[PDB]
Design a protein that fits this description.
The chain has about 50 residues and is mainly alpha-helical. It is built from 1 helix and no strands. The chain has one domain: Helix non-globular (Single alpha-helices involved in coiled-coils or other helix-helix interfaces), CATH 6.10.250. The chain is rod-shaped. The N and C termini lie far apart (about 70 Å). It is found in: Cytoplasm.
Length: about 50
Amino acid sequence: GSVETCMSLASQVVKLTKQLKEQTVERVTLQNQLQQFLEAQKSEGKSL
């Protein structure tokens, strides 16, 4: 028992955690792109 009840509450939590992960994965990836960006900048700074 309990599975049918908990599956409902847990899946709702799953929706939230999914969206949290999605926001994070795109944001970290964006910051990753920014990392490439700052790298590209520092690639000019490391040059003469």
